[PDB]
């Protein structure tokens, strides 16, 4: 069955890539939105269903589609976004943060911290989920 929904509470969020600071690992600046500078590379793609631990402890799908893990080589950051298969548009987007970890108490169901609410992701295939965590870890392992 699906994993149990955990209570998620806000804390603190801060990205180095969104700090405009000289090289990641820092905190200080006041850069603006941007203008022209984006170079992210994709790793793998796996279809999953985005769910939110609704009240009464009951996951609630928000929007499913094709999800791919993007990694910024130049920016030195990772971003997770989902695209629709009918609208072919962004249905979900997460801005990974420093010391990022991947939870997977299930076979093919990983959970993470949402904006202000808890959300979980469920892949369409098990392998795709296995390769997913393996990919992340592999990336986390490589670091630098």
From Swiss-Prot:
Residues 36-143 form the WH1 domain. Coiled coil: none annotated. It is found in: Cytoplasm, Cytoskeleton; Nucleus; Cytoplasm. Binds actin and the Arp2/3 complex. Interacts with CDC42. Interacts with FCHSD1. Interacts with FCHSD2. Binds to SH3 domains of GRB2. Interacts with the C-terminal SH3 domain of DNMBP. Interacts with SNX9. Interacts with the WW domains of PRPF40A/FBP11. Interacts with PTK2/FAK1. Interacts with PACSIN1, PACSIN2 and PACSIN3. Interacts with NOSTRIN. Binds to TNK2. Interacts with SNX33. Interacts with NONO (via second RRM domain); the interaction is direct. Component of a multiprotein complex with NONO and SFPQ; associates with the complex via direct interaction with NONO. Regulates actin polymerization by stimulating the actin-nucleating activity of the Arp2/3 complex. Involved in various processes, such as mitosis and cytokinesis, via its role in the regulation of actin polymerization. Together with CDC42, involved in the extension and maintenance of the formation of thin, actin-rich surface projections called filopodia. In addition to its role in the cytoplasm, also plays a role in the nucleus by regulating gene transcription, probably by promoting nuclear actin polymerization. This is Actin nucleation-promoting factor WASL. The gene is Wasl.
